[PDB]
């Protein structure tokens, strides 16, 4: 996160750290959706152009963390993965279209003041909140600058940007499975996700039932917090049916 703040303890209970076993390193962010399922970006696991292709035994998920590097002795829980599911039509060859993946834990995690699932949006929550100008919140342990690392979880609140503006800021072909967010060069407020934040959640707080809803997954961008550039996120609601399908068809 660039130009964000330190998160408060218990502020983002569904925040998950994707951790590589050896070298032991932070891979990406992710989110807890139930006691056995984690949602993240497909490119955190499979990105052939960079020879990236992790399997269940390559990683660990770390839940209820605040500190980036410390082993949070009786706060965090570490789980092993049972299975990884990448969207069948994930487009790593061109634009990261459908950048989403489900990971099923070997054993259910127990909830606590620091571990709690986020909600998945319904068509109606999506329809009233995914509006240009409305702000969401992004969290992660990623880079503080394009080109260092935070010691604690960082948070930033960013406005959703109109699709045409998103389209006109890049040469990459943008699809219905993506939305962009950030401040415009003129708003004179700034902030963004950056390397290390991928797979973390873009959330919004429903003014209706006061629950937190995950609307996006940190996906991609060009540089970080660049003027006239915007962060792009996987559109969770548009891929919800694939989400329901795998859970129903495979677990819980």
């Amino acid at each position: 996160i660039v130009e964000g703040s330190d998160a408060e303890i218990g502020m983002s209970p569904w925040q998950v750290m994707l951790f590589r076993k050896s070298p032991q390193e932070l891979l990406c962010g992710a989110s807890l959706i139930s006691d056995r399922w984690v949602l993240t970006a497909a490119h955190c696991l499979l990105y052939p152009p960079w020879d990236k292709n992790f399997t269940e035994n390559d990683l660990l998920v770390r839940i209820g963390k605040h500190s980036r590097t410390r082993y949070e002795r009786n706060i965090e829980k570490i789980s092993m993965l049972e299975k990884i599911y990448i969207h069948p039509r994930y487009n790593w060859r061109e634009n990261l279209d459908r950048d989403i993946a489900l990971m099923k834990l070997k054993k259910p995690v127990a909830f606590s003041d620091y571990i709690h699932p986020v909600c998945l949006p319904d068509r109606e929550t999506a329809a009233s909140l995914l509006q240009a100008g409305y702000k969401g919140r992004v969290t992660g342990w990623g880079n503080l600058k394009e080109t260092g690392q935070p010691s604690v979880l960082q948070v930033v609140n960013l406005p959703i940007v109109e699709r045409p503006v998103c389209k006109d800021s890049t040469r990459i072909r943008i699809t219905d499975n993506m939305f962009c967010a950030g401040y415009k060069p003129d708003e004179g407020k700034r902030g963004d996700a950056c390397e290390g934040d991928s797979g973390g959640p873009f959330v919004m707080k429903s003014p209706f039932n006061n629950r937190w809803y995950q609307m996006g997954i940190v996906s991609w961008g060009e540089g970080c917090d660049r003027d006239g550039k915007y962060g792009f996120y996987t559109h969770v609601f548009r891929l919800k049916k694939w989400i329901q399908k795998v859970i129903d068809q495979f677990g819980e």
């Binding site: 139930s34 709690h116 702000k135 609140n157 003014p207 629950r211 995950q214």
Partner: peptide, 30 residues
Amino acid sequence: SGEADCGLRPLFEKKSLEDKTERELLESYI
């Protein structure tokens, strides 16, 4: 929605405490 007790934080919503910048979000939804 995606859970049951989903999206209500033990240290904030459940005790009726607000985080430091959540109002910024809420004030943007009109």
